[PDB]
């Protein structure tokens, strides 16, 4: 592929499952959305 935009943030464990296209939540509606043609992977790790 051409290049990659790495979005790195800290999200709580109730909202961590919603990083995906077509989700509904507090962080999902009002902050971070994904379109249906979005292409990439989601990597999660426990920071506690």
């Amino acid at each position: 592929f051409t290049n990659v935009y790495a979005d790195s943030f800290v999200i709580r464990g109730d909202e961590v499952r919603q990083i995906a296209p077509g989700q509904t939540g507090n962080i999902a509606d009002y902050n971070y959305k994904l379109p249906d043609d979005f292409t990439g992977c989601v990597i999660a790790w426990n920071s506690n």
Binding site: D14, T24, G25, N26, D29
Partner: protein, 49 residues
């Protein structure tokens, strides 16, 4: 928000009709742990009647 609920073998079926629904605690706000919809679109809850 009620204090006492029922069990899984016998539940309490509440019939809610002839009113104007407020979806803002189920869509705009999320106090609640999981939202699982199957045949209904979650953004279109305030659209269909």
């Amino acid at each position: 928000n009620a204090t006492r609920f029922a069990s899984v073998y016998a539940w309490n079926r509440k019939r809610i009709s002839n009113c104007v629904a407020d979806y803002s605690v189920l869509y705009n706000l999320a106090p609640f742990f999981t939202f699982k919809c199957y045949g209904v679109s979650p953004t279109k809850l305030n659209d269909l009647c």
